[PDB]
């Protein structure tokens, strides 16, 4: 699990951490937690 957990209220606010860290913005934006993963 990657420690780039973002609140899934702002999906875009998750996508930024996603791209920034893991490059490919595959964010698991679940209500509880958005997890930024690459491809």
Task: Evaluate whether 18 touches 35 at the Cβ level (below 8 Å).
Answer: no
Structure solved using which method?
Answer: NMR
What does the chain come to in residues? Answer: 39
Strand-by-strand arrangement of the 33-37 sheet? 5-6, 33-37, 26-30
Separation of alpha carbons 29 and 24, rounded Å: 14
All structural domains of the chain: 5-37 (3.30.30.10)
Q: Which residues pair with 28 in a beta bridge?
A: 35
**Residue reference for tokens 């509880």:** 32
């Amino acid at each position: 699990g990657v420690p780039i957990n973002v609140s899934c209220t702002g999906s875009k606010d998750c996508y930024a951490p996603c791209r920034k860290q893991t490059g490919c913005p595959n964010a698991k934006c679940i209500n509880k937690s958005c997890k930024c993963y690459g491809c």
